[model samples]
Target: DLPRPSISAEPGTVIPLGSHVTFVCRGPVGVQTFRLERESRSTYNDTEDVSQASPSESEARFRIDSVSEGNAGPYRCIYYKPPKWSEQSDYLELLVKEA
Candidate 1:
């Protein structure tokens, strides 16, 4: 069967020089694993694997740790299916400014 996936999040904004924020990506189809990615200054950084059950929902959280001026960029989540299939969600822009 073909796999169709959807992504979502909570509190979609992150403030600069503030606490860490978590983003969740849920897939309707079976997702073996997932990855969180951040784009900064035209560079892409991929996170480690986030594992979940098959035919079930899977979520991945990305903590900004410390928000700095450089933390302003686009963020997204990707799901990895077995046999090397992957899907990327829509990009979420994160704005960071002086608090």
Candidate 2:
């Protein structure tokens, strides 16, 4: 299979400053790694790991606690079954609003 990654944001893309938010990326099972992209930074984090699951269920979670204006930017996820980067997901803009 190829990179067919899907991503989502929690507390929504538009959030109040200093609030918490989570970005979720999913790929097929057996994928132990994934990437979270935002602003100008690429990072990694996990949600709940599993030895096996469906792409619709397995995923990694990137979190932002006490978000700041600096957290605002285009967001996307990457990587999948290794050696095969997943197709880039649409940009999920992190719109930070002042409290």
Candidate 3:
């Protein structure tokens, strides 16, 4: 069985409007795909390798060039290895505030 991935935000989850943020999801090695989804909203997919590292971990990075009010919400991510999909990571709330 697949395990749940881990999700986190860079520069923090509380962001100011028109600022930048990146959502990172890390899972087991050899993951073919990673998907980042906002609760009841748009989703992002990544298949590129950010770089290989030790400890045999794999990850994907979803970046927002300019965060707006609409960007504030819950986020989660999952990974696909092959025949099975890993459980989604815990929800991460993105709180956006006035710049």
Candidate 4:
């Protein structure tokens, strides 16, 4: 069975405009790919392939530079294996405020 991954917002979930935010997704071994998705998936569909030197490493960092109200929404991450894709992580709502 595929292990479910986890997603978290760095710094904080409630961010401000022009602030940088990094979404970290951690998964167990055998994760070949990590993709981040927004609630509506309007335009934010990012993917990263794991390629670390560490043995059996886990985790991928998706960075969003200068976030704005457009980015203020619920997000989730899913990991992919050769056979199946892991369940999506818990929703991490992003609230962006004017700085």
Best by lDDT: 3
TM-score of 4: 0.85
lDDT of 3 at 59: 84
User: 1-99, model 1: which lDDT tens digit per residue?
Assistant: 324444444455657566555666656455666566676755543444454555465555656666777777777766666666466677777776566
lDDT of each: 0.60, 0.74, 0.85, 0.82
| Worst window of 10 by summed lDDT in candidate 2 | 43-52
Each model's total of backbone clashes:
1, 1, 0, 0
Each candidate structure's TM-score, on Cα atoms with residue i matched to residue i, is 0.68, 0.78, 0.89, 0.85
- Ranked by lDDT, the better of candidates 1 and 4 is 4
Q: Give the TM-score of candidate 1.
A: 0.68
lDDT of 2 by residue, 1-99 (tens): 565777899979899999999988776766656777664566444334433455455677788989898888888877656566677767789988897
* RMSD (Å) of each candidate, 1 decimal: 3.4, 2.9, 1.6, 2.1
TM match of model 2 to true structure: 0.78
Candidate numbers, best TM-score first, in rank order:
3, 4, 2, 1
Model 4 C-alpha lDDT per residue in residues 25-95, reported as the tens digit of each score: 88877677888888855554556666543665577888889998888889998888778888888889999
TM-score of 3: 0.89
Residue pairs whose backbone atoms clash in candidate 4: none
Cα RMSD for predicted model 3: 1.6
lDDT of 1 at 35: 64
Which structure among the candidates has the greatest TM-score? 3
